A paper describes a structure:
Here, we describe the tsclx4-/Zn-directed assembly of two proteins: cationic α-helical cytochrome c (cyt c) and neutral β-propeller Ralstonia solanacearum lectin (RSL). Sulfonato-thiacalixarene (tsclx4) provides possibilities for protein surface recognition (e.g., lysine encapsulation) while simultaneously supporting a metal site that can bind to other features on the protein. Whereas sulfonato-calixarene (sclx4) consists of phenol monomers linked by methylene bridges, tsclx4 is bridged by sulfur atoms that enable metal coordination. The metal-binding capacity of t-butyl-thiacalixarene has been explored extensively. In each of the model systems, incorporation of the macrocycle–metal complexes contributed to protein assembly and crystal packing.
In the presence of magnesium, the cyt c and tsclx4 co-crystals were diamond-shaped plates with dimensions of 100–200 μm. Crystals of cyt c and tsclx4 grown in the presence of MgCl2 diffracted to 1.7 Å resolution at SOLEIL synchrotron. In each case, the lysine side chain was encapsulated by tsclx4 in the cone conformation. The calixarene formed multiple noncovalent bonds (e.g., hydrogen bonds between sulfonates and neighboring residues) and acted as a molecular glue. Therefore, in the absence of a transition metal, tsclx4 binds cyt c similar to other calixarenes, suggesting that the sulfur bridging atoms had minimal effect on the protein-binding capabilities of the macrocycle.
Numbering used by the authors:
A (entry chain A), B (entry chain B): -5 to -1, 1 to 103
The structure:
C-alpha cells in the first residue's frame, strides 16, 4: 500500500460512520466492541491496555504504520486471519487515505 | 513497512549476492528459479509472462509497490503464505531500502 495524506475532515467522518460503532481514538477513551486506538501507530498489534484481543491479533505482531494499516483496512480478515474484528474492509484507496490521515492525528 | 530511498549502487550489490541466483531484472531476461522481475512495480503478483507461479502467489494478487515490497522481503513466507520462494528474509531495513532503490530502476 502507498498511504498518501488526504482529507482529515473526510476521514473523521469515515471514522464516525464506520468505526466509531466499535472504537474510540482519544487518550484514555473507552474500550467498546473493539479497543480504544490511542497510540496505535508505532505500537505492535494487540497491545492496548485493558483489552482482550484474539491470539491472532497479538501473534500477527505487526508494527502498525500508515502503509500496513491501509492493507489491513482493505480486508482485515485477510491481513490478520482469525481476527474477531467484524469489518469487511474499505475498498477505496481514497477512503483509506482520508481515514488514515485522520487516525494519525486523532490517535495521538 | 515504510520505504525510504537509499543507494542504488548498494542495492545492486545486494541483488547480485542475494537475488541473482534466482532472479533477473532485464526486459526479456530468463526465468531462473524465480520469475524475471522486469516490470514488477505497479503490476499484480503472479503475472510475469512465461513463469509458473504457486496458486498462493497468484491468489495473493498484491499490487507491488515499494512499501509492500519491503514488507515482503523482510519475511516472504509471512507475507505470501504458501510461496515457493525459499528466502528467510532481508532483516536490515537499510538493505531493504537500498535494494528496492536499485530494483525500481533496474526492473524498468
Ligand atoms: O468498502 S466500501 O464500502 O467503500 C465498498 C466499495 C466497493 C464495493 O464494491 C463494496 C464496498 S461491496 C463489496 C464488499 C465485499 S466484502 O465486504 O464482503 O469484503 C467484497 C466485494 C465487494 O464488492 S468483492 C470485491 C473485493 C475487492 S477487495 O477486497 O478490495 O480485493 C475489490 C473489488 C470487489 O468487487 S473491485 C472494486 C475496486 C474498487 S477500487 O476503488 O479499488 O478500484 C472499488 C470497488 C470495487 O468493488 S467499490
Ligand atoms: O548514488 S549511489 O549511491 O547509487 C552511488 C553511485 C555510484 C557510486 O560509485 C557510489 C554510489 S559509491 C560506491 C558504493 C559501493 S556499495 O554501496 O556497493 O558498497 C561500493 C563502491 C562505491 O564506489 S566500490 C566500487 C566497486 C565496483 S566493482 O568492483 O565493479 O563492483 C565498481 C565501482 C565502485 O565504486 S564504480 C561504480 C559502479 C556503479 S554500479 O552500481 O553501476 O556498478 C555505480 C557507480 C560507480 O562509480 S556511481
Ligand atoms: O540482513 S540479514 O537478513 O542478513 C540479517 C540481519 C540481521 C540479523 O539479525 C539476521 C539477518 S539473523 C535472523 C534471522 C532470522 S530467520 O532465519 O528466521 O529469518 C530471524 C531473526 C534474525 O535475527 S529474529 C529478528 C527478526 C526481525 S524481522 O523479521 O525483520 O522482524 C528483526 C530482528 C530480529 O532479531 S531485529 C534486527 C533489526 C535490524 S534493523 O537494521 O532493521 O534495525 C537488523 C538486524 C536485526 O536482527 S541484523
Ligand atoms: C465492530 C464490528 C468493529 C468495527 C466497525 C471496527 N472495528 Fe476495529 N476492531 C474490532 C475488534 C473486536 C478488534 C480486536 C480484534 C481482535 O482480533 O482482537 C479490532 C481491532 C482493530 C485494530 C487493531 C488494534 C490493535 O492491534 O491494537 C485496528 C487498527 C482497528 N480495529 C481499526 C479499525 C478501523 C480503522 C475501523 C473503521 C474502518 C474499525 N476498526 C472498525 C471491532 C471493530
Ligand atoms: C531462490 C532461492 C530465490 C531467491 C534467492 C530469491 N527469490 Fe524471489 N522468488 C523465488 C521464487 C521461486 C518465486 C515464485 C514464488 C511463488 O510462490 O510462485 C519468487 C518470487 C518473487 C517475487 C514476486 C514475483 C511476482 O509476484 O511476480 C518477488 C518480488 C521476488 N521474488 C523478489 C526477490 C528478491 C528482491 C530477492 C533478493 C532479496 C529474491 N526474490 C530472492 C525464488 C527466489
Amino acid at each position: 500500500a502507498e498511504f498518501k495524506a488526504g482529507s482529515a475532515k473526510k476521514g473523521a467522518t469515515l471514522f464516525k460512520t464506520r468505526c466509531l460503532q466499535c472504537h474510540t481514538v482519544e487518550k484514555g477513551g473507552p474500550h467498546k466492541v473493539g479497543p480504544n486506538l490511542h497510540g496505535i501507530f508505532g505500537r505492535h498489534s494487540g497491545q492496548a491496555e485493558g483489552y482482550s484481543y484474539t491470539d491472532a491479533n497479538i501473534k500477527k505482531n505487526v508494527l502498525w504504520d500508515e502503509n500496513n494499516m491501509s492493507e489491513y483496512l482493505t480486508n482485515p480478515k485477510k491481513y490478520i486471519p482469525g481476527t474477531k474484528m467484524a469489518f469487511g474492509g474499505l475498498k477505496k484507496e481514497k477512503d483509506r487515505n482520508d481515514l488514515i490521515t485522520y487516525l494519525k492525528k486523532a490517535t495521538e
